[PDB]
Design a protein around this ligand. Structure first.
Ligand SMILES: CC(C)c1cccc(CNCC(O)(O)[C@@H]2C[C@H](C)CCCCCCCCC(=O)N(C)[C@@H](C)C(=O)N2)c1
Length: 377
C-alpha cells in the first residue's frame, strides 16, 4: 500500500518539498513543506501576499483552541502564531486521521516564498526542539500514538519542477538500488548523526573529525544547501576552487550570492570534484560513505536574462550551528528515518543524479578507528 505514497511530493528548486494534507472538519486542503530539521506543525491562518490559501479555524467544527502563543525562529525566516488542535489527514499517505497540534501562523518574516505553492510546514524531528517546549507533541509522534502506522518514514527527494516521495510508515524497496546503510541517530532531538571522515576527489580533508560535527551534524530536508562549519567550509571551498581553477568565477559565487552561467549543454562538470561524507556505521569501527556529485551542490537556477544558458548557484554555505545535510545532499538518495531503531538509512535512489563518468554512491563497509571521538561535547 506504499505505492499510494510514491510521487506524493512536489516542489520548486530551492523552495523545498511539500505534501498535500487536510486539516479540520470539513477537510481544508493545504500543501505542507516537509522539514526533518524542525518539530512544529504550522500553517498559514491569515491572509498573506504569498499565500494562495490558508487554514480557517472558524470553519472547522473539530478545531480546539489551546489558548497559548507560539513562535519559531529558524536559521533564516520566522513566524509566530496561536496553538490549537484539529483533525489532520494525508490524502496520498496512510489512510488515517489524527488529532494533532497545529500552530496557526498569524505573522511571519521571510518565511513564505513568493509563488512557492505551499502554505505550511510539517516538522518531522523530535519533541525536544519543539516550540514553545518539548511538551508540544510533534505531528509524527501523534500519528504513531493514535494509529497503527509504524514509527519510521522515508524520503526520496528527486532533483532537477521537482518531485519525490515521503513513504509514511515504512520502506518502499522499489525506490532504491543496492543496499541500505545505516548511521545511528546520536540523540533524538534533531536527526543528529556523526560524520567521521570527509574526502574531496578522494583526498582526505585531514581535519580533526570533531570539526565536521562542531557543534552538531543533522539531516534536514528543510534546508536547501550543504552547510558546513567555518573551518570545514574554508577547507572545502579551498579544495573545490583548486580543482576548478581552469575557469574563473566571481568571489560572490563562492558565497552563494552570484550565479555562474555556461552555454547550454557545455557545463564543465568534470572540473568540479565529488565530495565524500563518511558516516558512523552500526558496528564497532565501521563506517560507510556517501558520494556527492557537483550536479548536487551546483544548484540550477533560472536565468533572469535574455539568455537561455545553463546557470547555477553554489549550494554550499558557511554555518555557525554545525553541519547541515540539506536537500541537495538528500537528492539522489533514499533516506530512511528509522525512528524505531534510532538510525538513519542511505541508499542510491531510483531517481539518482547522472554524470557521464561518475555516479553518486553509498558504499561500505569501511573501517574507521575511534569514531567515538568525532562527536562534539
Ligand atoms: C526550529 C528550530 C528547531 C531550528 C532552529 C534553527 C535551525 C534549525 C535547523 N533547521 C532549519 C530549517 O531547515 O528547519 C529551516 C526551514 C525553513 C525556514 C522552512 C521554509 C523554507 C523552505 C524552502 C527554502 C529553504 C532555504 C533554506 O535552506 N533555509 C530557509 C534554511 C537556512 C533554514 O533555516 N531552513 C531548526
Amino acid at each position: 500500500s506504499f505505492v499510494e505514497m510514491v510521487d506524493n511530493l512536489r516542489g520548486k528548486s530551492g523552495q523545498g518539498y511539500y505534501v498535500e494534507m487536510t486539516v479540520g472538519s470539513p477537510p481544508q486542503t493545504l500543501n505542507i513543506l516537509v522539514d526533518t530539521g524542525s518539530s512544529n506543525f504550522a500553517v498559514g491562518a491569515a491572509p498573506h501576499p504569498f499565500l494562495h490559501r490558508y487554514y480557517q479555524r472558524q470553519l472547522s467544527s473539530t478545531y480546539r483552541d489551546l489558548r497559548k502563543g507560539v513562535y519559531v525562529p529558524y536559521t533564516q525566516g520566522k513566524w509566530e502564531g496561536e496553538l490549537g488542535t484539529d483533525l489532520v489527514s494525508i490524502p496520498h499517505g496512510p489512510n488515517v486521521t489524527v488529532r494533532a497540534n497545529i500552530a496557526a501562523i498569524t505573522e511571519s518574516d521571510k518565511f513564505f516564498i513568493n509563488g512557492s505553492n505551499w502554505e505550511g510546514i510539517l516538522g518531522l524531528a523530535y519533541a525536544e526542539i519543539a516550540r514553545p517546549d518539548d511538551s508540544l507533541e510533534p505531528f509524527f509522534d501523534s500519528l504513531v500514538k493514535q494509529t497503527h502506522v509504524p514509527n519510521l518514514f522515508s524520503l526520496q527527494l528527486c532533483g532537477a519542477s521537482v518531485g519525490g516521495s515521503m513513504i509514511i510508515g515504512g520502506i518502499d524497496h522499489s525506490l532504491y538500488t543496492g543496499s541500505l546503510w545505516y548511521t545511528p541517530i546520536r540523540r533524538e532531538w534533531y536527526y543528529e548523526v556523526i560524520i567521521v571522515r570527509v574526502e574531496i576527489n578522494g583526498q582526505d580533508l585531514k581535519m580533526d573529525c570533531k570539526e565536521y560535527n562542531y557543534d552538531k551534524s543533522i539531516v534536514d530536508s528543510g534546508t536547501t544547501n550543504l552547510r558546513l562549519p567555518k573551518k570545514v567550509f574554508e577547507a572545502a571551498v579551498k579544495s573545490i576552487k583548486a580543482a576548478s581553477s581552469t575557469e574563473k568565477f566571481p568571489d560572490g559565487f563562492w558565497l552563494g550570492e552570484q550565479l555562474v552561467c555556461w552555454q547550454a549543454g557545455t557545463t564543465p562538470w568534470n572540473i568540479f570534484p565529488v565530495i565524500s561524507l563518511y558516516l558512523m556505521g552500526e558496528v564497532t569501527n565501521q563506517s560507510f560513505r556517501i558520494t556527492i556529485l557537483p550536479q548536487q551542490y551546483l544548484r540550477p537556477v533560472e536565468d533572469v536574462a535574455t539568455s537561455q544558458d545553463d546557470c547555477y548557484k553554489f549550494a554550499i554555505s558557511q554555518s555557525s550551528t554545525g553541519t547541515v545535510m540539506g536537500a541537495v545532499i538528500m537528492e539522489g538518495f533514499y533516506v530512511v528515518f528509522d525512528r524505531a531503531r534510532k538510525r538513519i538509512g542511505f541508499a542510491v535512489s531510483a531517481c539518482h543524479v547522472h554524470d557521464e563518468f561518475r555516479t553518486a554512491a553509498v558504499e561500505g563497509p569501511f573501517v574507521t578507528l575511534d569514531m567515538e571521538d568525532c562527536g562534539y561535547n
